[PDB]
Each structure stands twice: as C-alpha cells, then as structure tokens.
Amino acid sequence: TYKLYIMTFQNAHFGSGTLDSSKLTFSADRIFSALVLEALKMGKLDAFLAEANQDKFTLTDAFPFQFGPFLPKPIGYPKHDQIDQSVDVKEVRRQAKLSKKLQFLALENVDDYLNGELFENEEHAVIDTVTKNQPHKDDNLYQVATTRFSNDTSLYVIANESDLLNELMSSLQYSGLGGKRSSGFGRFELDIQNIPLELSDRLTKNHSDKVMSLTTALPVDADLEEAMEDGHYLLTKSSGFAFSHATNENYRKQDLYKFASGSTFSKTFEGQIVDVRPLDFPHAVLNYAKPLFFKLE
RNA sequence: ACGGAAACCUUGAUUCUAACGCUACUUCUAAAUAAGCGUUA
C-alpha cells in the first residue's frame, strides 16, 4: 500500500504445473517464498518472519506494467446494468469472448471497464517453448516454456516501504524468480516508484463495500461466509514440491485452494501464512495468502 | 520454505567424382644499291 515495486524481466519461467507451461505473471506466494529463501540464505530469516507476522505487511500478485500499472480483470462484473444494449447476438457474443480473453486492464480505465466499455488485451510477452537434451543419456528431450517480454513491459507489485524488503528485492534481482533460474530465466532489474494518486487512494484493506482482491488470498475461517454468499471468485491450486535443504528426498506439499485475483467481494477479510508443510517435516513451508484490495464504484 | 531441483539439441558426415581454353590460319604482296659529268683548261 506504500510503494509500486517494478521488476523488468527479460526471460522468465513461471510453471503452472509442468516444465513446459509458463504463465505471464506469477502469484504472491511465489515471491514470498523467494523472499523467504533469500532471507534464510542471508541469515536474517527471523526479522522477515517478524515483519510478515505484522498486519502492516501487504503483498499482491505481479501485474503487467507498461507505462502504467495494470489490474486483473474483476471476475464477477460482466453485469448487464451497464452492458444493456440492443445490438445483435453476433456482437454480444463477440464482446463476451473479448471480455473473457481479457485478463488485465490499464489503471486509467478500470472504472471505464465497469461502465460497459470493451477493451482488448495488449502485447506484453510471448510464451515460447525450447527443447533441450542431455548428451550422455539419449532419451531425455525436455521442453521448457518461457515468458519473453517485449515493448518495455515489466511486472509490478505493491508492498510496504521497508529497508529489509528493499534489500531483499535487490538480492532477488540477481537471483531470478521462478523456473530454471540457473539456466537463463527469472532474472530482472528492480525499480522503485511512487504509487500514482489515482491508485493509492483506492488501495484499501478494511471496510464493507465492494472490494476486488489483488492477491491470491485465502480468507480466515471466521469470515469465509461473506465471501461465499456475496463473493465472486476463481479457485486456484497451489500444489508442488516443497523445496528443502534438510531432506534428500523431495516431498510434495499440501495442495491448497485459494481465491484468485481479482476476485470481487462485498467486504474485506484477513489472510493466512498457512503452513503447507508435510507431516514429520523439520522446518515449515509458508504459503502466503494475504489480500490487498481495490475499491470499486 | 519460488510446479520447484538436477539435464549441451548433442554424437558421426570431404560440396566430392569426370572434363586439354581446344579446332583452322604463310608476317604476306610489287621493288637492279642505283642516277646525273656540266663548264673551263
């Protein structure tokens, strides 16, 4: 809610379940895990844990940044109250398909999207697959997907201004983000920018109006009811193998189903640093689900 | 405590074999090392 962190990538790989799958943008649990690993490699893991335990710490999923912050399409607002038209069915289905394909909108027109206007996606990155082999066992021919960006398009997140977070981001920018980081993917250059006046006044965390989430956040059990009755959302898995320097064998962490972005709700909630570690495991596995919200008209 | 870790698009291959810058064409055609002896004595 304080800064507007920008990460300019050249090549990246954000696996969505397979080595040959790469999403355009990553989720906040991935960057929180990356921060946790960088902090533990630094040695100042306890300070970052204490900072994350505070309610001031807020993080959001990466969104596209092309001469202005972008926001995920608010799932649950194709509402006919602003899209009531007398056009033919062909144009109605064409605009429905165009809105379904849309995933990100520029900040300057997000409310315009809520006025019935129709916008198209913009060229942000090309996702291409590369085949690689192992020239000692002539059976492995594995494919890796990338997210090669273009047109000065970066990724951005919103988080509090902290010196520990600043230095952690600076160490992240030479350590990569997601995927085969020691192969030419994930690396970025960081820039710190101020939140625009048209955006900072909308980033909220505590009130009872229509809020669109910015983080893949699973609410606490106390207030899930309000997200169930009057909440529009999408369900995203967070499975995978838990990285661990303490166990020789790789353990699958517990599959957890969160709420995607931008899921719309009628009231805000509280996130969880949920322990997705398997049983009998020495150290925790922290999954970050803490929402930053956006007010709607 | 990042659907993540590890992984060479790698090994072997001669732009090589055959093929006369060759066939025909006189440095040729006429031509005396030769002509004039004045005037004075």
Å between CA of A76 and C1' of B27: 107
Tokens of A241: 């193998």
Q: Which of A81, A104, A84, A82 is nearest to A92 (CA)?
A: A84
Q: Which of A168, A154, A135 is nearest to A39 (CA)?
A: A168
Cβ(A131)–Cβ(A20) under 8 Å? no
Per-residue HEC secondary structure of chain A comes to: CCECCEEEECCCCCCCCCCCCCCCCCCHHHHHHHHHHHHHHHCCHHHHHHHHHCCCCCCCCCEEECCCEEEECCECCCCCCCCCCCCCHHHHHHHHHHHHHCCEEEHHHHHHHCCCCCCCCCCCEECCEEEEECCCCCCCEEEEECCEECCCCEEECCECCCHHHHHHHHHHCCCCCCCCHHHCCCCEEEECCECCHHHHCCEECCCCCCEEECCCCCCCCCCHHHHHHCCECCEEECCEEECCCCCCCCEEECCCEEECCCEEECCCCCCEEEECCCCCCCCCCEEEECCCEEECC
A217 CB closer than 7 A to any strand B atom: no
- At residue A144, φ and ψ (nearest 5 deg) are -125, 130
Å between CA of A38 and C1' of B6: 20
Q: How far apart are CA A63 and CA A293, in angstroms?
A: 14
Q: How far apart are CA A125 and CA A14, in angstroms?
A: 13
Cα dist from A63 to A84, A155, A266, A292, whole Å: 30, 5, 23, 13
A133 CB closer than 7 A to any strand B atom: yes
Å between CA of A247 and C1' of B37: 143
Amino acid at A275: D
Beta-carbon contacts of A269 under 8 Å, excluding residues fewer than 6 positions away, are A217, A219, A220, A223, A224, A226, A227, A291
Cα dist from A27 to A80, A157, A282, A288, whole Å: 30, 10, 26, 10
In chain A, positions 31-50 with C-beta closer than 7 Å to nucleic chain B are 31, 33-34, 36-38, 40, 45, 49
Per-residue HEC secondary structure of A256-288 comes to: CEEECCCEEECCCCCCEEEECCCCCCCCCCEEE
A212 CB closer than 7 A to any strand B atom: no
If one counts every other C-beta atom within 10 angstroms of the C-beta of residue A140, the result is 10
Q: How far apart are CA A112 and CA A102, in angstroms?
A: 14
Q: How far apart are CA A31 and CA A58, in angstroms?
A: 12
A229 Rama sector, left if φ>0, alpha if ψ -120 to 50, beta otherwise = alpha
Q: How far apart are CA A93 and CA A152, in angstroms?
A: 33
- At residue A41, φ and ψ (nearest 5 deg) are -70, -35
A177 CB closer than 7 A to any strand B atom: yes
Q: Which of A29, A20, A7 is nearest to A180 (CA)?
A: A20
Q: Which of A89, A56, A32 is nearest to A286 (CA)?
A: A32
Asked if omega into A176 is within 30° of 0 (cis), the reply is no
Beta-carbon contacts of A197 under 8 Å, excluding residues fewer than 6 positions away, are none
Q: Which nucleotides of B are covered by protein (CB under 7 A)?
A: 1-11
